[PDB]
Every structure is written in C-alpha cells, then in structure tokens.
Amino acid sequence: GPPSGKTYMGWWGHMGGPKQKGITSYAVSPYAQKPLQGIFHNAVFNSFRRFKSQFLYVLIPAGIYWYWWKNGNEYNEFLYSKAGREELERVNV
Amino acid sequence: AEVTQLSNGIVVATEHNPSAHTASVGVVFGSGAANENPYNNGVSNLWKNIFLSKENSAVAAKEGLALSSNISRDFQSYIVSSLPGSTDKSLDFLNQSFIQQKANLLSSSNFEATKKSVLKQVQDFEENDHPNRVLEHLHSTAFQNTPLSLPTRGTLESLENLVVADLESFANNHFLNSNAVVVGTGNIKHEDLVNSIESKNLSLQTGTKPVLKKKAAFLGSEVRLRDDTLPKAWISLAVEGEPVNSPNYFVAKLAAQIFGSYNAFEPASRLQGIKLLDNIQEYQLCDNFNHFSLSYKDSGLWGFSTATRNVTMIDDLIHFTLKQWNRLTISVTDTEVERAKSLLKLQLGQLYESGNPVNDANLLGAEVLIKGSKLSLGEAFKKIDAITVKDVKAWAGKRLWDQDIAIAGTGQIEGLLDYMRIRSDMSMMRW
Numbered sequence: 134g135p136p137s138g139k140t141y142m143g144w145w146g147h148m149g150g151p152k153q154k155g156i157t158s159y160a161v162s163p164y165a166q167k168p169l170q171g172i173f174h175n176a177v178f179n180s181f182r183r184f185k186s187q188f189l190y191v192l193i194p195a196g197i198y199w200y201w202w203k204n205g206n207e208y209n210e211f212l213y214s215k216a217g218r219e220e221l222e223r224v225n226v
Numbered sequence: 227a228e229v230t231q232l233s234n235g236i237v238v239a240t241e242h243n244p245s246a247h248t249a250s251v252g253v254v255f256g257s258g259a260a261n262e263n264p265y266n267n268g269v270s271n272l273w274k275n276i277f278l279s280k281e282n283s284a285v286a287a288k289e290g291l292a293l294s295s296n297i298s299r300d301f302q303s304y305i306v307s308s309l310p311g312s313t314d315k316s317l318d319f320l321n322q323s324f325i326q327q328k329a330n331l332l333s334s335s336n337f338e339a340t341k342k343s344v345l346k347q348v349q350d351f352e353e354n355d356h357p358n359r360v361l362e363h364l365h366s367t368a369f370q371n372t373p374l375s376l377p378t379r380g381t382l383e384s385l386e387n388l389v390v391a392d393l394e395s396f397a398n399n400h401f402l403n404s405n406a407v408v409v410g411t412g413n414i415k416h417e418d419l420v421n422s423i424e425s426k427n428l429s430l431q432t433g434t435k436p437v438l439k440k441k442a443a444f445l446g447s448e449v450r451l452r453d454d455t456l457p458k459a460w461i462s463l464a465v466e467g468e469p470v471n472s473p474n475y476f477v478a479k480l481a482a483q484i485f486g487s488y489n490a491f492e493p494a495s496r497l498q499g500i501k502l503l504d505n506i507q508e509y510q511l512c513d514n515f516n517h518f519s520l521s522y523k524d525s526g527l528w529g530f531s532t533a534t535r536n537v538t539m540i541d542d543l544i545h546f547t548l549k550q551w552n553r554l555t556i557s558v559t560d561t562e563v564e565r566a567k568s569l570l571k572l573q574l575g576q577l578y579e580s581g582n583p584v585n586d587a588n589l590l591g592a593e594v595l596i597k598g599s600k601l602s603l604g605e606a607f608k609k610i611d612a613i614t615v616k617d618v619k620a621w622a623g624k625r626l627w628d629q630d631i632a633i634a635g636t637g638q639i640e641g642l643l644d645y646m647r648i649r650s651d652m653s654m655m656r657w
C-alpha cells in the first residue's frame with residue numbers, strides 16, 4: 134500500500150541488506166537426496182558438542198542454589214525438630 | 227538433393243547443391259567436450275584456436291581457402307571452405323596439416339601465444355556474456371559429477387595447468403579413424419567420393435577411442451551467481467530432455483515451439499503468440515523468451531531462458547510460465563498445435579537449408595556421425611504432420627509432470643524463490 138516510514142528492512146528484491154558480489158550457492162533437489170541415514174549418530178554427536186560447550190553454565194548455579202536451599206533446610210532441622218523449645222526464644226528475641 | 231554415404235573406416239558424405247557455388251570440405255570428429263576428464267577441460271578449444279592461429283596465414287597466402295571450426299559438446303569439426311575449383315588444394319592443405327607435418331604447428335612460443343589468447347577470451351566471456359554464462363552454468367549444475375557438465379571452453383585453472391603432454395594425449399586418443407567423417411557440402415558431386423578414399427589420404431591412429439564408464443545422469447540443482455552490481459537479471463530453467471535418435475525428438479521440438487520466443491521491444495513479436503504473452507503483457511514482467519530443446523548423444527535439455535528488468539516480480543514471471551506448462555500438459559487446443567506445426571516447419575527449413583555451406587556441413591556431420599544417413603526435409607515434414615494433440619499430451623505427461631528441474635541465475639536475484647515454491651507449482655493445484 135502507501136509507503137511506510139523509516140525502516141531497517143524492506144520486502145523481496147529491496148530488503149536493504151549490504152551490497153555484496155561474488156557468492157555462489159547450490160542445492161541438490163531434496164527429492165534426490167535420501168536425507169537422513171545417520172540421524173542417531175548425528176544427534177549423539179550434536180548433543181555431545183552442545184554439552185561440551187556448556188559445562189559450567191548449568192551445573193554451577195543449580196549446585197550453589199541447591200547448597201543454599203540445603204543450608205536453609207538444615208538450619209530448619211536444627212530449629213524445627215523437637216528443638217524449637219530452646220532456640221525459638223533466641224530467634225525471636 | 228539426396229546425400230550419398232560410404233564407409234571404409236573413414237566415412238565420405240556429400241550433399242550436392244547446384245544452388246550454391248562455394249564448395250567446402252572438412253572433418254567432423256565424434257568426440258568433443260563430453261569425452262574429457264575435468265582434470266583439464268580446455269583442450270578441445272585450445273586445439274581449435276591452434277588450428278585458427280597460424281595456418282590461416284598459410285591458407286590465405288598459398289591459395290584461396292578460408293577455414294573455421296566450432297565445438298559445442300561432441301560436434302568437434304574443422305571445416306575448410308573453398309571455391310568450387312579448389313577442393314583439391316583444400317584437401318591438400320588438410321592432409322598436410324592433420325597427419326604430416328604435425329610438429330611445426332605445435333611450436334612452443336606459438337603454444338604460449340595461443341594459451342594467452344584463450345585465457346583472455348575466456349576471461350572476457352566470464353566477465354561480459356551473461357546470457358550464455360547462465361546456460362553454461364545450467365549445464366554444469368544439471369550433470370553434476372559427469373563428463374557432460376564441464377564447460378565447452380574450460381576454466382582458468384584448467385587452461386593454466388597442462389601444456390603439451392595432455393594435448394598430445396588427447397590428439398592421440400581422439401583423432402582417429404573410428405569416429406572421423408569427411409564432409410563435402412557445397413557445389414561438388416562425386417570427386418569427394420573418391421579423393422577421400424586415396425592412398426595419400428589416411429587418418430592416423432587406426433585404433434579405438436577410449437570408452438567412458440558413467441555415461442550421463444540428471445539431478446535438480448541450483449546455482450546463484452548473484453552479482454547485484456549488474457543491472458538486469460538473467461535466469462534459466464531446464465527439464466530432462468531427449469537425446470538424438472529417439473522417436474520423440476520432433477515432439478519435444480514442437481512442444482518447445484508451441485510457446486515460442488518473444489521480444490518486448492519488437493512490436494511484431496508483441497502482437498502474436500499464446501495466453502502467457504498476454505498475461506505478461508498485462509503487467510510488464512520480462513523482455514526476452516527463448517524456449518529451447520538442446521539435444522546431445524547421451525541426454526537432452528528442454529527448458530526456458532529469459533532476461534528481465536522488473537526485479538520485483540521474478541516469482542510472478544516464473545509462476546505464469548509454470549502454469550502455462552501445466553496447461554500444456556493438461557489441455558491443448560488444435561489451432562495452437564497447427565500454428566506450432568507451421569512455425570516449426572518454417573524454422574527447421576530455415577536452419578537446415580541456410581545459404582552458408584558451413585552450417586549445412588556441420589549439421590550433416592552431426593547427423594552422419596550418430597545416424598549413418600541424413601534425414602531429408604520431406605521425411606521430417608512427413609513425420610511432423612503425424613503429431614497430434616493426444617501424442618503431445620502423452621509426451622508431456624511423462625517429461626513435464628513432477629520432474630527434476632535446474633535453475634541458473636545471476637544479477638539481482640533477491641526475489642527468486644529458492645527451490646520449493648518454484649517446484650511445488652506443478653502438481654499442487656485443483657487438478
């Protein structure tokens with residue numbers, strides 16, 4: 134319809150990307166491909182690599198917060214198991 | 227007139243024609259750019275340029291005779307035109323050039339000069355000629371891993387790789403007696419029939435040409451030589467065609483002729499044709515049409531080539547043409563069949579009976595090598611009057627209905643749908 138305002142992209146043919154020249158692509162007509170043959174092996178290798186690149190980012194924060202929750206709970210058993218009779222006073226006073 | 231053929235190793239075929247008065251004689255080999263490994267493609271064109279480098283001075287100075295050559299895929303020929311009374315000296319030069327002497331021609335400095343000239347020519351072709359480059363890339367991407375996709379003039383690295391060893395190997399392995407045929411198109415009758423069968427006129431290497439293992443194939447693919455600096459956009463399509471010596475060649479030719487060609491800037495070409503021309507005339511879409519049916523010994527290529535400037539509507543331009551192909555494969559009117567018959571008769575009579583004997587000799591050699599005898603105009607007309615709407619429908623059902631296609635493009639092809647929206651427009655409608 135009517136032209137729009139300022140934009141960082143357009144439509145097909147005039148998207149607005151950087152000018153480039155010298156790139157060649159290909160394709161193999163997926164009908165004549167027989168696409169998947171080692172799907173289980175591909176999945177195994179991809180999962181291995183993805184886990185290899187992200188060791189600590191999942192193991193560390195969950196571990197530290199499990200430790201924090203464990204500390205809170207164990208303080209609770211030091212208090213809230215037939216023992217509050219002699220520590221609730223010092224907690225609340 | 228009718229042609230006469232005989233064969234004792236060498237085949238002598240003549241098409242006598244008193245209408246013309248420029249006798250010609252040459253040699254057509256059955257091996258071209260389709261029988262060479264991709265190690266160094268540029269050998270046949272290198273030989274062609276070698277023949278077109280220094281013997282031109284010899285033929286011009288010694289007597290009156292002009293020589294020319296052309297190699298496309300397997301019609302490698304070296305035609306030597308002449309005057310009607312100079313066929314003897316023409317064959318004398320041919321004999322002195324292609325058996326002995328064959329050493330002074332392959333001089334070193336001459337070889338590097340020819341190599342530089344060929345490198346410059348191929349670089350110029352790659353830089354400038356887009357409409358033929360897209361077709362060459364279509365050939366390259368339609369026959370992947372097969373000696374039918376490599377370009378007919380080679381690549382830069384292929385030309386710069388080898389020097390003399392593989393050239394002489396090609397000469398020894400493909401310039402033989404098995405697949406060599408002489409031609410006598412022009413204004414001669416029977417002297418060619420005898421002069422070729424002579425003690426002095428023999429061809430070296432009376433052996434056999436090596437046979438390839440993987441003959442040919444066809445798989446859909448894409449190539450996108452996207453150079454957005456170029457103003458226009460050149461794209462092409464192709465479907466598995468039909469080789470020569472098949473009882474459907476004329477049917478495919480008529481199917482190609484039905485849609486025909488079109489030029490936007492020519493008023494005559496804008497005022498005829500079929501429904502798709504009106505559909506693309508309503509909203510301007512493209513400038514050129516070229517419906518082709520390329521046929522070689524091993525396989526064929528029936529497709530579509532075009533060039534457009536309205537880069538935004540490439541999808542519409544492709545969609546209309548594919549829908550018209552589907553209309554052809556579902557329902558054809560007899561009036562367009564009759565007009566296609568007449569147009570094909572006109573174009574084939576123009577092509578097979580042009581005034582230049584060089585083209586006639588090339589066609590005669592191409593027919594003789596893989597046929598054994600040329601098919602005259604009358605028989606072609608007889609075989610084309612039998613083409614019917616049912617035959618065209620049955621043929622298009624097998625070839626144009628859910629078959630692999632290959633697209634080659636360059637320029638500004640941002641709007642070109644990659645592979646699925648361009649292939650799923652054949653059998654996914656309300657059939």
Ligand SMILES: CCCCCCCCCCCCCCCCCC(=O)O[C@@H](COC(=O)CCCCCCCCCCCCCCC)COP(=O)(O)OC[C@H](O)CO
Nearest residue numbers: 541542544545546548549647648649650651652654655656
């Ligand atoms: C009160 C309803 C009355 C009928 C409604 C008709 C419209 C039905 C669809 C309703 C909205 C669905 C949302 C998506 C619609 C677009 C689908 C689309 O784009 O898919 C194809 C188009 O699908 C269609 O819609 C095509 C059929 C047109 C139908 C026209 C109206 C028919 C009305 C009869 C009833 C239809 C509904 C039946 C429901 C069971 C694309 O292929 P193409 O052929 O357009 O691409 C060609 C390309 O350029 C390359 O060649």
